[PDB]
Protein backbone atom coordinates (compact mmCIF):
# COMPACT_ATOMS: atom_id res chain seq x y z
CA UNK A 1 0.00 0.00 0.00
CA UNK A 2 0.57 3.73 0.25
CA UNK A 3 0.42 4.92 3.90
CA UNK A 4 -0.09 8.57 4.87
CA UNK A 5 0.90 10.02 8.21
CA UNK A 6 -2.23 11.89 9.30
CA UNK A 7 -3.12 8.72 11.32
CA UNK A 8 -0.50 6.67 13.22
CA UNK A 9 0.82 3.99 10.84
CA UNK A 10 -0.48 0.80 12.52
CA UNK A 11 -0.40 -2.41 10.48
CA UNK A 12 -1.19 -6.00 11.32
CA UNK A 13 1.87 -8.20 11.70
CA UNK A 14 1.39 -11.87 12.43
CA UNK A 15 4.04 -13.44 14.61
CA UNK A 16 3.67 -16.97 15.95
CA UNK A 17 0.10 -17.20 14.60
CA UNK A 18 -1.36 -14.27 16.48
CA UNK A 19 -2.29 -10.93 14.95
CA UNK A 20 -0.84 -7.77 16.55
CA UNK A 21 -0.72 -4.12 15.45
CA UNK A 22 2.85 -2.83 15.17
CA UNK A 23 3.92 0.71 14.11
CA UNK A 24 5.83 1.46 10.83
CA UNK A 25 8.80 3.24 12.31
CA UNK A 26 11.66 4.77 10.33
CA UNK A 27 13.14 6.47 13.32
CA UNK A 28 13.97 3.00 14.50
CA UNK A 29 16.94 0.80 13.70
CA UNK A 30 15.37 -2.35 15.09
CA UNK A 31 12.11 -4.17 15.47
CA UNK A 32 11.08 -4.05 19.18
CA UNK A 33 7.99 -6.03 20.25
CA UNK A 34 6.34 -6.03 23.64
CA UNK A 35 6.92 -8.94 25.93
CA UNK A 36 6.11 -12.20 24.21
CA UNK A 37 7.15 -15.77 23.86
CA UNK A 38 9.81 -16.01 21.24
CA UNK A 39 11.23 -19.40 20.25
CA UNK A 40 14.71 -20.53 21.27
CA UNK A 41 17.58 -18.60 22.72
CA UNK A 42 18.24 -14.98 23.36
CA UNK A 43 21.10 -12.68 23.90
CA UNK A 44 21.16 -9.27 25.56
CA UNK A 45 21.08 -5.96 23.85
CA UNK A 46 21.30 -2.42 25.17
CA UNK A 47 19.00 -0.11 23.10
CA UNK A 48 18.34 3.59 23.89
CA UNK A 49 15.29 5.61 22.75
CA UNK A 50 14.09 9.02 24.01
CA UNK A 51 13.80 8.25 27.75
CA UNK A 52 17.25 6.74 27.35
CA UNK A 53 18.59 3.18 27.48
CA UNK A 54 17.04 -0.18 28.10
CA UNK A 55 18.08 -3.84 28.15
CA UNK A 56 16.18 -6.06 25.65
CA UNK A 57 16.25 -9.78 24.79
CA UNK A 58 17.24 -10.54 21.19
CA UNK A 59 15.96 -13.33 19.05
CA UNK A 60 17.48 -14.10 15.68
CA UNK A 61 15.81 -15.20 12.58
CA UNK A 62 12.16 -14.72 13.63
CA UNK A 63 9.53 -15.09 10.90
CA UNK A 64 7.07 -12.23 11.13
CA UNK A 65 4.50 -11.56 8.47
CA UNK A 66 3.59 -7.85 7.93
CA UNK A 67 0.50 -6.93 5.86
CA UNK A 68 0.83 -10.46 4.46
CA UNK A 69 4.52 -10.05 3.79
CA UNK A 70 7.19 -12.29 5.24
CA UNK A 71 10.37 -11.06 6.90
CA UNK A 72 12.88 -13.24 8.79
CA UNK A 73 14.98 -11.08 11.02
CA UNK A 74 15.97 -10.08 14.41
CA UNK A 75 13.21 -9.24 16.82
CA UNK A 76 13.98 -7.60 20.19
CA UNK A 77 11.54 -8.43 23.10
CA UNK A 78 11.07 -5.67 25.65
CA UNK A 79 9.26 -2.91 27.45
CA UNK A 80 8.13 -0.68 24.62
CA UNK A 81 5.05 1.57 24.73
CA UNK A 82 4.06 -0.20 21.46
CA UNK A 83 5.26 -2.85 18.94
CA UNK A 84 7.97 -1.16 16.74
CA UNK A 85 8.64 -2.48 13.15
CA UNK A 86 12.01 -0.92 12.40
CA UNK A 87 14.41 -0.35 9.55
CA UNK A 88 15.74 -3.93 9.71
CA UNK A 89 12.40 -5.37 8.49
CA UNK A 90 11.20 -2.28 6.60
CA UNK A 91 14.07 -2.78 4.09
CA UNK A 92 13.11 -6.49 3.95
CA UNK A 93 9.49 -5.75 2.77
CA UNK A 94 10.70 -2.95 0.48
CA UNK A 95 9.44 0.09 2.37
CA UNK A 96 10.26 3.62 1.26
CA UNK A 97 9.67 7.19 2.37
CA UNK A 98 8.12 9.13 -0.54
CA UNK A 99 7.61 12.91 -0.72
CA UNK B 1 11.74 11.20 -4.22
CA UNK B 2 12.00 7.73 -2.71
CA UNK B 3 14.13 7.55 0.45
CA UNK B 4 15.40 4.04 1.36
CA UNK B 5 15.71 2.72 4.88
CA UNK B 6 19.04 1.04 4.25
CA UNK B 7 20.44 3.88 6.35
CA UNK B 8 18.85 5.99 9.08
CA UNK B 9 16.75 8.64 7.21
CA UNK B 10 18.45 11.97 8.03
CA UNK B 11 17.62 15.23 6.28
CA UNK B 12 18.83 18.81 6.50
CA UNK B 13 16.35 21.12 8.26
CA UNK B 14 16.84 24.89 8.24
CA UNK B 15 15.71 26.47 11.48
CA UNK B 16 16.46 29.97 12.75
CA UNK B 17 19.30 30.70 10.29
CA UNK B 18 20.87 27.34 10.98
CA UNK B 19 21.23 24.24 8.97
CA UNK B 20 20.82 21.31 11.35
CA UNK B 21 19.83 17.75 10.53
CA UNK B 22 17.00 15.69 11.82
CA UNK B 23 15.61 12.22 11.47
CA UNK B 24 12.43 11.61 9.44
CA UNK B 25 10.46 9.48 11.87
CA UNK B 26 7.17 7.87 11.36
CA UNK B 27 7.21 6.73 14.99
CA UNK B 28 7.08 10.27 16.37
CA UNK B 29 3.76 12.08 16.54
CA UNK B 30 5.41 15.42 17.24
CA UNK B 31 8.74 17.00 16.38
CA UNK B 32 11.36 17.18 19.19
CA UNK B 33 14.51 19.37 18.84
CA UNK B 34 17.82 19.70 20.65
CA UNK B 35 17.46 22.12 23.61
CA UNK B 36 17.28 25.62 22.06
CA UNK B 37 15.23 28.79 22.60
CA UNK B 38 12.23 29.53 20.43
CA UNK B 39 10.28 32.76 20.44
CA UNK B 40 7.05 32.99 22.32
CA UNK B 41 5.59 31.05 25.15
CA UNK B 42 5.68 27.37 25.64
CA UNK B 43 3.55 24.82 27.40
CA UNK B 44 5.60 22.08 29.21
CA UNK B 45 4.79 18.52 28.18
CA UNK B 46 6.13 15.04 28.95
CA UNK B 47 6.79 12.83 25.89
CA UNK B 48 7.86 9.25 26.51
CA UNK B 49 9.24 6.38 24.43
CA UNK B 50 11.89 3.70 25.12
CA UNK B 51 13.67 4.30 28.39
CA UNK B 52 10.73 6.42 29.46
CA UNK B 53 9.57 10.02 29.55
CA UNK B 54 11.36 13.39 29.09
CA UNK B 55 10.25 17.03 29.67
CA UNK B 56 9.99 19.24 26.52
CA UNK B 57 8.72 22.83 25.96
CA UNK B 58 5.91 22.99 23.36
CA UNK B 59 5.93 25.95 20.92
CA UNK B 60 2.99 26.19 18.51
CA UNK B 61 3.24 27.27 14.90
CA UNK B 62 7.03 27.01 14.33
CA UNK B 63 8.30 27.19 10.76
CA UNK B 64 10.68 24.43 9.77
CA UNK B 65 12.14 24.14 6.28
CA UNK B 66 12.45 20.31 6.00
CA UNK B 67 14.98 19.58 3.19
CA UNK B 68 13.88 22.63 1.17
CA UNK B 69 10.16 22.50 1.84
CA UNK B 70 8.38 24.58 4.50
CA UNK B 71 6.05 23.29 7.22
CA UNK B 72 4.38 25.14 10.12
CA UNK B 73 3.31 23.33 13.26
CA UNK B 74 4.07 22.64 16.89
CA UNK B 75 7.72 21.94 17.79
CA UNK B 76 8.89 20.47 21.16
CA UNK B 77 12.25 21.70 22.52
CA UNK B 78 13.75 19.24 25.00
CA UNK B 79 16.71 17.06 25.83
CA UNK B 80 16.57 14.82 22.74
CA UNK B 81 19.29 12.51 21.50
CA UNK B 82 18.74 13.80 17.95
CA UNK B 83 16.42 16.40 16.42
CA UNK B 84 13.29 14.37 15.40
CA UNK B 85 10.97 15.24 12.52
CA UNK B 86 7.62 13.69 13.46
CA UNK B 87 4.34 12.90 11.82
CA UNK B 88 3.13 16.50 12.40
CA UNK B 89 5.40 18.16 9.84
CA UNK B 90 5.83 14.94 7.72
CA UNK B 91 2.31 15.10 6.18
CA UNK B 92 2.84 18.83 5.71
CA UNK B 93 5.65 18.05 3.23
CA UNK B 94 3.38 15.27 1.95
CA UNK B 95 5.51 12.45 3.15
CA UNK B 96 4.31 8.90 2.87
CA UNK B 97 5.30 5.27 3.38
CA UNK B 98 5.18 2.71 0.53
CA UNK B 99 5.66 -1.00 -0.19
Amino acid sequence: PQITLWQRPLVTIKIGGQLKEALLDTGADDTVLEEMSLPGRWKPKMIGGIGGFIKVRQYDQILIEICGHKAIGTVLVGPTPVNIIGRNLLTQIGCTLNF
Amino acid sequence: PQITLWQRPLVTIKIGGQLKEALLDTGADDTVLEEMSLPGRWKPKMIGGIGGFIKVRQYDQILIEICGHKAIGTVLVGPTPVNIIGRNLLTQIGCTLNF
Binding site: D25, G27, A28, D29, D30, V32, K45, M46, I47, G48, G49, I50, I84, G86 | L23, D25, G27, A28, G49, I50, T80, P81, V82, I84
Partner: peptide, 4 residues
Protein backbone atom coordinates in the same frame (compact mmCIF):
# COMPACT_ATOMS: atom_id res chain seq x y z
CA UNK C 1 13.18 6.78 17.79
CA UNK C 2 15.20 3.64 18.52
CA UNK C 3 18.94 3.61 18.16
CA UNK C 4 21.63 0.97 18.66
Amino acid sequence: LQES
